[PDB]
Amino acid sequence: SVGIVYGDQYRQLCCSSPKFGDRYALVMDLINAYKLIPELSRVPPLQWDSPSRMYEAVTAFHSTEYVDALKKLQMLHCEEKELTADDELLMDSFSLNYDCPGFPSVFDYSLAAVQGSLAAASALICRHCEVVINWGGGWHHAKRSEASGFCYLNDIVLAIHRLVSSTQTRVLYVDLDLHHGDGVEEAFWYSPRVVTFSVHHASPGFFPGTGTWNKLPIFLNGAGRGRFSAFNLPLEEGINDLDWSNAIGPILDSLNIVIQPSYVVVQCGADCLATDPHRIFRLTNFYPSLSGYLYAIKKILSWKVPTLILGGGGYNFPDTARLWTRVTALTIEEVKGKKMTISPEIPEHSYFSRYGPDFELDIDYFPHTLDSIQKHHRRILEQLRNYADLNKLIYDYDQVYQLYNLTGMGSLVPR
C-alpha cells in the first residue's frame, strides 16, 4: 500500500505561503492528471482534540515560547495594524523576519506540514502503508526555537520522533535536498537511534553553511551518545545525474547494511534540478541516462523498509511537479510491483498551460578524474565503522566490501 497525504483544506493551507505559492497544487494535480491518485491510499492530515494536545504535539521538539510567537505572528498579520517595537524585537529573537516573514496564514501553513507528516508516520507505524508520500512536508531547516530558510516548524523532526518512539528501533534519515539538512541533524545530534545523512552543496557563503569541514580541518559528526551518527557528503557545484548517483549509492547501501533501520525518512527536495533557479547541481527527472533522484529512490525502496518520502526545496514549480510525479509513479511501481507508464506529453488538466513551451514531462534541459570524491567515501565508511563499534552493532565488512567492490573500490572499506 502506497500512501500520500492530501485533503481539501490541506491543499489550501499548503498553497497559502508567499514563497511557495501554488506549487503543492501543481504537484498533486499533475499526479492526478497522470491518473496516479487511484493507485494511492489517501492519508488524511492529523487533527487534534484541543489546542492543548496540539501544543503538546508541536512542543515535543519546539519551544513553547517559539510556538507562541509563531502563533502571535499569525494573529498580527491578520489584523491591519502594525507591529509595536516590542513585537518587532520578539519576532526577531526567533528569526521571524527577513527570509522567514510573517503572513496571514504563517502558523496554519507551518502546522499543516506537521499534521501531514505526523499522519504519514502514523500510517507507517500501524502498517497501513509501506510507504507514505507528503509533498507538502520536508521543512528541514526549522530549529527548536528558530525559523530558518522558510522553515517555521520542523515536520521532519516531529515525524521522526514519532517513528523512533513507536514500539532497538532505528531511523535512517536521507536528505537529498540541494541544502544541508541542518535542522534535522541538529535535533538528533546526540541520538544514536536517528542516523542522519545529507548530501548537498556547500561552498563559502552558501546557506546554511554547515554540513562540511570545520591542525587540518575536520568533520563534526555528532556528539555524546550521538558521536558518528551524523553523516554529510558536501559536493561541488555542477554535478550530474550519474556522478551524484555514483556518489550516494554505495553510501546509501552501506548505511542500510550497518544501521539496519526500522524506518527510512527521505527528504526529496527538488532544487538539485538543473533547471532550478539556484543553477548549482544538474540533476534531471529523466527515466529511460537516469535521474539521480529516481536512482536513489529506487535503491532505498529496494531495501523493503517502511519509508516516509517528503518534499522540500524546489523553486521551478513546474519542474518540481515533473520530478515528484515521476518519483510518485516509481514508488507505485516498486512497492505494488505494478507497471506505471507515464506519457511524455503532459495530460490535459487545469495547470497544463504552466508546463510550456514544450508541455512535456522531461525537464527542458540538455546534459553535456580530479572531481572524484573517493576520500569522502573512505571518510564516511570509517565513520560508519566507528558508529557500529560505539553502538555495538554488527559491522559486516564482507557485505560492505562486496558492494564497493562492484565498482572496483573495495579497498576503501575498513575492517
Ligand X SMILES: Cc1ccc(C(=O)NO)cc1NC(=O)c1ccccc1
- Binding site for Zn(2+), by residue number, is 177, 179, 271
How far apart are the C-alpha atoms of 282 and 161, rounded to whole Å? Answer: 33
Place of cell 572496483: 408
Cα distances from 189 to residues 154, 210, 222, 229, in angstroms, run 15, 13, 5, 7
Find out whether 4 and 332 touch, Cβ atoms under 8 Å. Answer: no
User: Helix/strand/coil (H, E, C) string of 167-193?
Assistant: CCCCEEEEECCCCCCHHHHHHCCCCCC
C-alpha cell at 85: 517595537
**Position among 190, 287, 359, 395 found at the interface with a copy of itself (CB under 8 A):** 190
**Position among 341, 392, 408, 415 found at the interface with a copy of itself (CB under 8 A):** 392
130 binds K ion (CB under 5 A): no
Instruction: Give the shortest CB-76-to-a copy of itself separation in angstroms.
Output: 12
**Which window, 96-104, 175-183, 337-345, 370-378, contacts K ion (CB under 5 A)?**
175-183
Which residues inside 328-347 make contact with a copy of itself, applying CB under 8 A?
336, 344
How far apart are the C-alpha atoms of 85 and 67, rounded to whole Å? Answer: 20
**Which window, 28-36, 105-113, 156-164, 301-309, contacts a copy of itself (CB under 8 A)?**
105-113
**Position among 18, 21, 224, 277 found at the interface with ligand X (CB under 6 A):** 277
Cis bond upstream, residue 357 (ω within 30): yes
3-state secondary structure of 5: strand
Instruction: Give the shortest CB-29-to-a copy of itself separation in angstroms.
Output: 17
182 binds K ion (CB under 5 A): no
Closest C-alpha to 372, from 254, 247, 250, 190: 247
How far apart are the C-alpha atoms of 78 and 87, rounded to whole Å? Answer: 14
188 binds K ion (CB under 5 A): yes
How far apart are the C-alpha atoms of 386 and 346, rounded to whole Å? Answer: 48
- Which spans of this chain sit near Zn ion (rule: CB under 5 A)? 177-179, 269, 271, 313
Say how many CA atoms lie within 13 Å of 69 toward its Cβ. 26
The mark string for 201-230 relative to K ion (x by CB under 5 A, - otherwise) is -------------------------x--xx
354 binds a copy of itself (CB under 8 A): no
User: Does 141 qualify as catalytic in the annotation?
Assistant: yes
Binding residues for ligand X (CB under 6 A): 49, 99, 141, 149-150, 177, 179, 207, 269, 271, 277-278, 312-313, 315
Binding residues for K ion (CB under 5 A): 175, 177, 181, 188, 191, 194, 198, 200, 226, 229-230
> Which are the catalytic amino acids?
141
